[PDB]
Amino acid sequence: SGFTSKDTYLSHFNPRDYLEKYYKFGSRHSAESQILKHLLKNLFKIFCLDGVKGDLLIDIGSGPTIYQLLSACESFKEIVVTDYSDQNLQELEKWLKAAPAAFDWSPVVTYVCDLEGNRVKGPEKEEKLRQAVKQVLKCDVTQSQPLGAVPLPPADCVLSTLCLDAACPDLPTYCRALRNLGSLLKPGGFLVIMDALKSSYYMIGEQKFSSLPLGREAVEAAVKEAGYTIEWFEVISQSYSSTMANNEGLFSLVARKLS
Ligand SMILES: Nc1ncnc2c1ncn2[C@@H]1O[C@H](CSCC[C@H](N)C(=O)O)[C@@H](O)[C@H]1O
Ligand SMILES: NC(=O)c1cccnc1
């Protein structure tokens, strides 16, 4: 081991656990909820207020979540979700069929439906997404071909939340990650990434997963220095509960692939 290996994810990552610990979106102002609320506002600002639209968006390291895709789905016609953990894909798929024993995302869904103008209702927001999500593929950011042999058109947007820091055991592995992800996008295409800053781990209940503790300095470096212009970059100091993670806040950026 050392830094959580690929198949520690295959074997110890519990989708349902994860969701409960991070995504229950309680009415009590928990660190996990403050952070979630912010990822939300940002994703709204990016996909509904800015000029981030397109035909195709690949969401990388989706894991078992969809919150990151509630706004994007008012901007893209085709949404391909991906993850390295087959059992996370299984949990997402549960939600896409809208099965009764799927995690309940409506507090979240609700939160978004306001941000956006309360124009549409939960039910209609959820349907809209289900129809966007066209495929659910296996992926690996540490491979020059993250979706393997699967044929997809050059994407307009690659997006990733709380993934690259987790999958990348070191800096070089990260920058290659970024480069490999760049191979899925057309030039002038958008890279949206949201991760934790200076995070060395995070806990899913009892089990602990590694994490490359990156500064804003190094992240910006490895992105410019990996083929992208940065449209904006935001840092929030707000962290996860100490029991949860050792992060120092979280960044999010929007980057353009050089032509
Ligand atoms: N090499 C790799 N390639 C792709 N995904 C990986 C990976 N290593 C770990 N992962 C995925 O990293 C994710 C980190 S948790 C984040 C899940 C989701 N993107 C969210 O915003 O909450 C998990 O889904 C795990 O399956
Ligand atoms: N960046 C991380 O270490 C992280 C935090 C929360 C969930 N998943 C990954």
Asked if 232 and 253 touch (Cβ cutoff 8 Å), the reply is: yes
Please give the backbone phi and psi of residue 175, each rounded to the nearest 5 degrees, phi first: -60, -30
> What does the DSSP assignment read for the chain?
--S--HHHHHHH--HHHHHHHHH---SS--HHHHHHHHHHHHHHIIIIISS--EEEEEEET-TT--GGGTTGGGTEEEEEEEES-HHHHHHHHHHHTT-TTS---HHHHHHHHHHTTS-S-HHHHHHHHHTTEEEEEE--TTSSSTTTT---PPEEEEEEES-HHHH-SSHHHHHHHHHHHHTTEEEEEEEEEEEESS--EEEETTEEEE-----HHHHHHHHHTTTEEEEEEEEE-----TTTB----EEEEEEEE--
Task: Provide the residue type at 90 as one letter.
Answer: Q
Report the C-alpha gap between 118 and 110 in whole angstroms. Answer: 9
- Nearest residue (CA) to ligand 1, atom 12: 163
Say if ligand 1 is within 6 A of residue 129 CB.
no
Ligand closest in space to the Cα of 198: 2
Query: Ligand 2 centroid vs 160 CA: distance in angstroms?
Result: 12
Task: Provide the residue type at 169 as one letter.
Answer: P
Ligand closest in space to the Cα of 21: 2
What are the structural domains, with CATH classification, of the chain? 1-259 (3.40.50.150)
Angle at 23 between CA 19 and CA 25, to 5 degrees: 145
Ligand closest in space to the Cα of 15: 1
**Residue 195, annotated ligand binder?**
yes
Q: By what technique were these coordinates determined?
A: X-ray
In 3D space, the residue among 195, 234, 237 whose CA is nearest the CA of residue 212 turns out to be 195
Q: Which atom of ligand 1 is nearest to the CA of 142?
A: 1
Task: Provide the residue type at 216 as one letter.
Answer: R
**Resolution of the experimental model in angstroms, please?**
2.7
Say if ligand 2 is within 6 A of residue 105 CB.
no
Say if ligand 1 is within 6 A of residue 84 CB.
yes
Report the C-alpha gap between 179 and 143 in whole angstroms. Answer: 10
Cβ-in-10-Å burial (0-12, 13-18, 19+) of 183 comes to middle
Q: Which atom of ligand 1 is nearest to the CA of 194?
A: 21
- What are the structure tokens assigned to 37, written together? 């609320």
